[PDB]
């Protein structure tokens, strides 16, 4: 009897109010049939839509909800804090507290600047790297996402890796002209870029595990190679940990892999469900940021007390013993259970997980890069995704997004999910 | 005795955690003596610091607090909404509600996209204008502020006889090369740019009343001229109403002046004290925004239900009869009271106001542009600012920021503020 009738009505109205009916493109479900699920509420590992359907959720609002949606302690903290005002536009003690917690948690971060989104964090960190090195070019990887600042919106493909051409209309060629690209997991391509642009490269930036082209982890050779190559040449290494931060380990991907970058961006989890980003790193670099130094970046709502409170209480929960070990346990079971279901029902699949982050592809694999991920059978993914909705499971509405587990997911949530997957896979 | 003991200790600690001890440059008080006031709470028109000092606040968290800080109805709405979760990462009904309200309120907006800051809104609107027109250049005015995207960080004087130059390290030369500039209130300079760059200009963007170089209103000739000139040449007119929106009138400066732009950015008031921005305008233009069209912009926390709720209830209050008439009454009295106090005490001053936005300069004036504003006696401003703190009044900690009133400011507040101003002015 599964119905999305109320979502259908409200989304039809939305399309005449907002472009494509949404405030972010993935939300429009275009690759999975075009009927988004409008959300009424979330709690723990569950989401309820406006039709009243319940789902075991593996999106976690794209990463923030690692301790569970609408956590009671976080809500109580927000309720108390808001009595004193939600925005100050001036320093407050909560900013000191969250800053101290982040510096303690994340290996590379000795000093930190809070902003309102991952997009802002990545803008700031790029400007900072360019300012510190007095160099304009940088390297990013095809398939990585660093928000929508113009410099990141660069076209990749045959014959254009060194050209910095725009990947979207409205982005002038000049804006992307200092952006170089290489394939993820291709150290040799990066070596070639270094050789052809001696003295011009400020930084290499990467998602230390790709989550925005599906789940794609780095090979040890690649990620160590980047650390060595950058260090040997006085180039900065930047980890975009907006998604991996506080999710792969308390100290993020840099702790998980034991590789320490020069600068790090954060977001999502550090806002505890409110809009917050950050960039931080080596103190000598961070001292270039205004008003300590000449590099300009500013925000009105940055460091607001609600966001700080939510972040503080989220990190306090995560810092407790056994957190990441629990995520590993349930996510290993989930990932291997889904892949085994695919094997049993005759569908080529591959995938993997680290702590609370996972993904699977309808492809033989292995998947090492963006190009590999494009081998995925997206028609089949769509059938799987829609079938799972009907069975009460909500995965990311795209083959090209990672999935997320939370501390509120139980072993039973996982078992019910695997069972549903087996049923759906047996039918598609 | 006026004591900032606890603020001094906490700010010293902050300087070892965040660059310059702050999350936005103006907060460090560098132009007014360097000892920021750390905030404990805000309510109505008042702020209390961590040392227990009370102030009548004319900053309003830089614009969001137009109905008063910590409004009971807004807080009650947040308390109810948060029970259902603070972030969904997917569409919800509250997004439809705020979108409808914004479309109704703002003349130019037929379709709207929500984002997490004014910086993001201005990035998006510029990319959109460039995409729609298929042209790369745009015009910005000296003294206007549109957030910190690279294209806007252009050095004073550049972008006229030489390509736009970086105003900050870390901004590549190429990034500002498509930015043209002119003095505010200089229509002739804009006409010259149009004639010199035929087929190359996407848009003119401006604060329709400047608030980021002090308070500087447009002359009728300038703003009327811009609307006709853009129309005549197929160039988009963009109003950055992040600060003026919902403050000069329910429909912002465009309503107040009766001049309808093609695109508008919003922020601040629209989030009711939470991080929210938006860009919107003519439907045919907005249909280019992904996923309706090819122009890329995205955001994880965009349209989150907490921020939507806060905006909805803030706008609901503003829509009540008498709002802007009240703001006009108290702000006229405030502004003229301060200017009269300056005259009586022998200090050259000039200033002005519209509705809930005002400013004064320690300069003879009149001030028509950025260059004029820079004739201000900033040493005297600092003395005035610090003296007023001790009298229990908190103005913006800069000569180059506008001031803000709210529905919670009362004739009592205004009377007390003017009396304090005369006491301080008679002594500095
Ligand atoms: C790795 C990465 N970087 C940056 C961003 C941008 O963050 P936001 O959406 O908050 O702007 C995201 C969110 N998609 C992300 O996952
Ligand atoms: C006119 C204008 N435009 C854009 C911005 C940038 O907004 P945010 O600080 O939210 O990024 C500001 C700061 N209030 C502003 O005043």
Author numbering:
A (entry chain B), B (entry chain A): 7 to 434
Sentences from the paper on this structure:
The activated glutamate is first reduced to glutamate-1-semialdehyde (GSA) by the NADPH-dependent glutamyl-tRNA reductase, and GSA is then isomerized to ALA by glutamate-1-semialdehyde-2,1-aminomutase (GSAM; EC 5.4.3.8; Ilag & Jahn, 1992). GSAM, also named glutamate-1-semialdehyde aminotransferase (GSA-AT), is a pyridoxamine 5′-phosphate (PMP)/pyridoxal 5′-phosphate (PLP)-dependent enzyme. GSAM catalyzes the transamination of GSA substrate to ALA product by an unusual intramolecular exchange of amino and oxo groups via the intermediate 4,5-diaminovalerate (DAVA). Clear electron density in the structure of AtGSA1 allowed the modelling of 428 residues in each monomer, with the first six N-terminal residues missing. The overall structure of AtGSA1 is similar to other known GSAM architectures and consists of three sequentially arranged domains: the N-terminal domain (Val1–Asp63, mature protein) comprises one α-helix and a three-stranded antiparallel β-sheet, the PMP/PLP-binding domain (Tyr64–Gly328), which is also the catalytic domain, contains a central seven-stranded β-sheet with one antiparallel and six parallel β-strands, and the C-terminal domain (Thr329–Ile434) is composed of a three-stranded antiparallel β-sheet with four helices covering the outer surface.
Here, we present the high-resolution structure of AtGSA1 at 1.25 Å resolution. AtGSA1 forms a dimer in the asymmetric unit. As shown in the AtGSA1 structure, subunit A only binds PMP and the gating loop is fixed in the open state, consistent with previous reports that the catalytic reaction is initiated by PMP. However, the PMP orientation is different from that previously observed in the PMP-containing subunit of Synechococcus GSAM or aspartate aminotransferase, in which the PMP cofactor is usually tilted by 20–30°, moving the amino group away from the catalytic lysine. Instead, the orientation of PMP in subunit A is similar to that of PLP with the amino group pointing towards the side chain of the active-site lysine. In subunit B, both PMP and PLP are observed within the active site. Therefore, both PMP and PLP are modelled in the ligand density with occupancies of 0.54 and 0.46, respectively. Compared with subunit A, the gating loop of subunit B undergoes a dramatic conformational change as demonstrated by the large Cα deviations of the residues Lys161–Gly170. In addition, two forms of cofactor are observed within the active site of subunit B. Thus, the gating loop of subunit B may be in an intermediate state, and the disrupted network of hydrogen bonds between Gly163, Ser164 and Gly165, and Glu148 and Thr187 may result in the gating loop of subunit B becoming ready to close. Our results support the negative-cooperativity mechanism of GSAM.
